[PDB]
Design an enzyme around this catalytic site. Structure first.
Site, PDB file in Angstrom:
ATOM      1  N   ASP A   3      31.160  33.678  51.317  1.00  8.07           N
ATOM      2  CA  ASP A   3      29.955  33.438  50.535  1.00  8.07           C
ATOM      3  C   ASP A   3      28.867  32.750  51.343  1.00  8.07           C
ATOM      4  OD1 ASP A   3      30.989  34.562  48.110  1.00  8.07           O
ATOM      5  OD2 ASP A   3      32.203  32.740  47.861  1.00  8.07           O
ATOM      6  N   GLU A  43      36.817  26.075  44.264  1.00  8.41           N
ATOM      7  CA  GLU A  43      35.576  26.414  44.950  1.00  8.41           C
ATOM      8  C   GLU A  43      34.457  25.509  44.434  1.00  8.41           C
ATOM      9  OE1 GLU A  43      33.690  30.080  43.650  1.00  8.41           O
ATOM     10  OE2 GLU A  43      32.491  30.243  45.470  1.00  8.41           O
ATOM     11  N   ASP A  68      38.306  30.306  41.608  1.00  2.00           N
ATOM     12  CA  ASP A  68      36.934  30.775  41.756  1.00  2.00           C
ATOM     13  C   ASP A  68      36.033  30.171  40.679  1.00  2.00           C
ATOM     14  OD1 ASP A  68      34.835  32.673  42.817  1.00  2.00           O
ATOM     15  OD2 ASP A  68      35.099  33.587  40.821  1.00  2.00           O
TER      16      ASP A  68
HETATM   17  O1  LIG Z   1      32.049  36.265  42.803  1.00  2.00           O
HETATM   18  C1  LIG Z   1      30.915  36.822  43.457  1.00  2.00           C
HETATM   19  C2  LIG Z   1      31.147  38.249  43.897  1.00  2.00           C
HETATM   20  O2  LIG Z   1      30.292  39.078  43.091  1.00  2.00           O
HETATM   21  C3  LIG Z   1      28.905  38.767  43.231  1.00  2.00           C
HETATM   22  O3  LIG Z   1      28.164  39.571  42.374  1.00  2.00           O
HETATM   23  C4  LIG Z   1      28.476  38.968  44.674  1.00  2.00           C
HETATM   24  O4  LIG Z   1      27.368  39.858  44.753  1.00  2.00           O
HETATM   25  C5  LIG Z   1      29.649  39.443  45.509  1.00  2.00           C
HETATM   26  O5  LIG Z   1      29.256  39.547  46.875  1.00  2.00           O
HETATM   27  C6  LIG Z   1      30.816  38.479  45.369  1.00  2.00           C
HETATM   28  O6  LIG Z   1      31.958  38.997  46.032  1.00  2.00           O
END
Ligand SMILES: OC[C@H]1O[C@H](O)[C@H](O)[C@@H](O)[C@@H]1O
Ligand SMILES: OC[C@H]1O[C@H](O)[C@H](O)[C@@H](O)[C@@H]1O
Lengths: 583, 583
Positions: free
Chosen positions: A426, A351, A314
């Site tokens: 996303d 990502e 991520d």
């Molecule tokens: O990594 C991002 C994550 O947190 C963020 O604040 C987003 O609002 C959420 O939708 C997502 O799952």
């Protein structure tokens, strides 16, 4: 003047410790010499090519050269330098070049290939755990904007286990799960404990069962790895002093230097979200905890009993030191290296919403979520939109110049394992992004299985789930078949069978043959096999395919769609995609 | 539709902790919105731009946006996303793009700039020590092919010291010396001792004097750093057992693992030359000896009493582990990092005959010998040849597409310190390469001082030394003025004065304005100042310069050459280069 080369058989062949490279030319004023430009240990090499006696196809002159394989780095970059008496011309992944190509935009083949070679044989499926399936031990309430994203619908890992027969029927061979570790949210990117599976998803016991059941069904399993930042409720940080020595509220904390606090005392975080404080990788103990140590988090879930097949990283692009991305490339390399120590065939991919080429070109990771190289080209050509939902008016020429330009930065082996998808947790659902043009959706589905790379279905795409961006792209999966697009489901089923059946859809090169206005035509190429794909986004039309030595086959068998090929004329119905196999 | 932007004032301005970016447009169908695409910590950002009330030039609409500077890495990458109701268009260093540009081919500015900021103010001169000048305490014998390269003509460092007044008259402010350390050859890349200056060049005492004399004359001094390989007569390796425990002939040698020996026992070396065995950087003691330790070789010559200004890194691209270039980028980064520890403004640049962008784009070195971005474009456009002395037929369009494509991978600050030269000790003399077209030589000389980058004269180029490739490009310098091209000498003198006088030749942006067939026209741009350069490689001609807001000045003062600009018509004599200043 014409030229053909793809980084695959029949154009290349490994033989003893030599890589034989073949180039095809055709035209009235053919170069009397051709130099194969190759590279050994970053040194450019002029290797001479010789004309072969036998014409591989009508009107085609073949040249051959050799790359010595005993020395050099595994990645073999090369291109073709055509020489006349007074002038030169380069042949490259992006056609002819009047000045030398970029070193990093040549053809390239990884010999030896130390990558995760199983990835190219997979069909992936991404599951947002809470929204997929409840185990046997309310689900139809519409997602809102106020509450959606804090509301647990209650899917769990046993639910995934119980649905494995459905996923095998669909053609799936590999799962990518969104975060499953202990964390307060429904999405769980605010990691509280990297060592335990959240009880809300069934805890450690349920992930153990999923690993067993996927193993037994021959399926791979990838976990979501969140290492750019931790959750603000993690013991290391601990916003709410639930412990004694958190970093947020104790200058003497054992982890105070795992975070960056400003002169005023505000922790650095992810894009302004205070529940996601950013990890400071200057600290050598943080490095040991995440990937350096033998039982670091990265290796922990890759050895028994967990034995996961790899990691989706991520926010891979922002991880680094000092509150930002300083020394990012070194740290991603360290994570990947740690992963391969534990499991040599671990699949590590990042990502990347943006341009990932610098990461991939330095080999700090095996692959990327191919938003730039695959997703956004299709959003623009098919749905007139882009990453920012800004309008987009690009035709086939532009769409394929874009897709082929991106690939050009990648070796053939890298191209084959790029993580291609049409949407994700996303983004808005691609079906919704099409608006009035939703009839184009089957075109994207065919493209997703026939463009180089591994395809990944976003859960529910296959039965026609739609919706706008986060939170509305996280709808519960509709297990009521009355709420399922069964025709679309069958298309996914047939495409995964085509890909399972034909080597060129998994291992083959790719040559765009026609790209004008509404029509794209490309062929996958592997040994003697050929798979032809014709995509027509607009009204019905006919298109002439120039005689091409890539298409010089015994005959064509139509496998999907209603297009028709006869005597070099493609008859394409409105809003259609067609696939042929060579017989 | 038209657009203008250069990564320099008047288009950018730092103000408090903000970088103001300005874009100019002009045309009939102007976008109603423009997004400034910037990047913070590798995350792409959509920053909105607003239309300025005041038109900067007739018929020109200006847009402005801001990059927040408190967060992010020093290198600020950005480009312009033009938005209409139905479509978008990107504006980039390489004009308009219908699909997104590569991240690494955007505009870029280094704020803060931690680079060696003195480099942009220099005129460099490369000296092959044996062939330049004998001190006061035979020189005309023609160089042969049998003996040339093993024959000492006897130049030394005191000879260089004694010629400093000549080099100051020429305009030189910095020296780059070829290897001076103890070694058996005349060129001395077969290093025997990295700690001592070869007595043949005057030894340690003579380099101490040269450092003093250059210091006193305000001149910089760069040494040739040879770290990919050692000499086979080095004590570490020792082919001829002149010592007890060399690596070539002792398995127990303290340095056995500083080299790679095959299963059969042949040492890995540089491109098959057995006198240059390659150093194995897997070994942690070799790493400490070359750059890791406080008194490693790299730092040794950068602290007192030596206090050299930096390093030219020989064969920078092949240095690495295991007999090849494995982990090359990490090791070059380590060398540069070690150098800046000793001297924060140390200039470290690499010998790159090929495409250096991956090295420069990862910031492992400040600069490169710009063979790909400068030298070979001129060889092709001006002398119809290239790195392999293969014929080349490229026009102005192609030449400038090539030069501008390469620059696009580089920030403005990187572009300004690229090491531009027309030839070196590893190439034929450019004067010889011109053959019958030798009248084009003054054109190259003007170009060398007006294209972004720091210019480096190869010793003797300025008085018309010619000759073919190594060994014939290492002729003795002719100090007899009767053997000197004094007209050419004066041109170098005048160009260095133009560059010393005008900020835009040292700090300015660069916009190609016309590039067709035989004529290149470009303007350097800095604040309100403009320097216009028109190059005509063929017969005399007239060329229309479209009204351009970059050229909207009070008037033009001709400074060099015989070209004439009047009412947007350039009258250019055959085989000419002209330079104007804006008044
Ligand atoms: O990594 C991002 C994550 O947190 C963020 O604040 C987003 O609002 C959420 O939708 C997502 O799952
Ligand atoms: O680094 C290369 C050096 O050694 C090579 O063998 C060349 O023959 C020589 O001319 C050069 O000075």
């Amino acid at each position: 003047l014409k030229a053909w080369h793809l980084p695959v058989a029949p154009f290349i062949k490994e033989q003893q410790e030599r890589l034989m490279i073949t180039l095809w030319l055709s035209g009235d004023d053919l170069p009397p010499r051709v130099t194969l430009r190759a590279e050994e240990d970053n040194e450019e090499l002029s290797l001479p090519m010789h004309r072969l006696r036998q014409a591989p196809h009508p009107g085609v002159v073949a040249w051959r050269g050799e790359i010595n394989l005993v020395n050099g780095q595994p990645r073999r970059r090369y291109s073709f330098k055509l020489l006349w008496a007074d002038r030169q011309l380069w042949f490259t992944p992006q056609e002819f070049n009047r000045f030398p190509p970029a070193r990093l935009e040549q053809f390239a083949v990884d010999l030896p290939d130390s990558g995760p070679q199983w990835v190219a044989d997979q069909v992936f499926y991404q599951i947002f755990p809470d929204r997929f399936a409840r185990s046997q031990s309310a689900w139809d309430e519409p997602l809102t904007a106020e509450a959606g994203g804090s509301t647990f619908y209650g899917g769990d890992l046993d639910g995934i286990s119980e649905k494995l027969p459905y996923l095998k029927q669909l053609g799936v061979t590999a799962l990518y799960l969104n975060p499953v570790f202990v964390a307060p949210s429904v999405h769980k990117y605010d990691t509280e404990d990297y060592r335990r599976v959240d009880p809300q998803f069934g805890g450690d016991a349920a992930l153990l069962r999923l690993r067993h059941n996927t193993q037994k069904e021959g399926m791979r399993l990838i976990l979501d790895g969140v290492f750019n930042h931790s959750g603000d409720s993690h013991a290391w940080f601990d916003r709410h002093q639930r412990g004694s020595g958190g970093a947020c509220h104790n200058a003497d904390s054992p982890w105070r230097d795992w975070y960056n606090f400003s002169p005023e005392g505000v922790a650095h975080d992810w894009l302004g979200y205070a529940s996601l404080p950013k990890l400071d990788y200057r600290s050598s103990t943080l490095i040991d905890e995440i990937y350096g140590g033998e039982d670091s988090v990265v290796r922990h879930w890759l050895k028994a009993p967990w034995s996961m097949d790899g990691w989706r990283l991520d926010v891979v692009h922002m991880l680094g030191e000092g509150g930002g991305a300083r020394n990012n490339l070194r740290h991603i390399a360290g994570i990947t290296q740690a992963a391969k120590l534990e499991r040599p065939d671990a699949f590590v991919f990042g990502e990347h919403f943006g341009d990932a080429r610098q990461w991939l070109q330095a080999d700090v990771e095996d692959s990327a979520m191919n938003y730039r190289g695959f997703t956004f080209p299709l959003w623009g050509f098919l749905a007139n939109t882009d990453i920012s939902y800004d309008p987009q008016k690009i035709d086939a020429q532009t769409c394929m110049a874009w897709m082929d330009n991106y690939r050009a930065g990648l070796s053939h082996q890298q191209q084959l394992r790029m993580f291609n998808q049409l949407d994700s947790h996303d983004t808005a659902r691609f079906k919704s992004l099409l608006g009035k043009d939703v009839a184009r959706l089957p075109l994207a589905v065919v493209w997703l299985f026939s463009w180089p790379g591994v395809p990944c279905i976003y859960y529910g795409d296959e039965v026609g789930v739609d919706g706008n961006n986060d939170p509305f792209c996280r709808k519960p999966f509709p297990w009521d078949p009355a709420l399922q697009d069964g025709d679309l489901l069958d298309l996914y089923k047939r495409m995964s069978k085509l890909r399972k059946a034909h080597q060129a859809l998994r291992y083959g090169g790719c040559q765009v043959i026609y790209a004008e206005d509404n029509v794209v035509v490309f062929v996958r190429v592997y040994k003697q096999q050929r798979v032809l794909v014709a995509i027509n986004r607009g009204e019905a039309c006919e298109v002439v395919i120039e005689d091409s030595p890539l298409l010089d086959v015994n005959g064509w068998q139509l496998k999907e769609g209603a297009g028709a090929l006869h005597d070099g004329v493609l008859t394409l119905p409105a809003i259609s995609a067609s696939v042929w196999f060579s017989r």
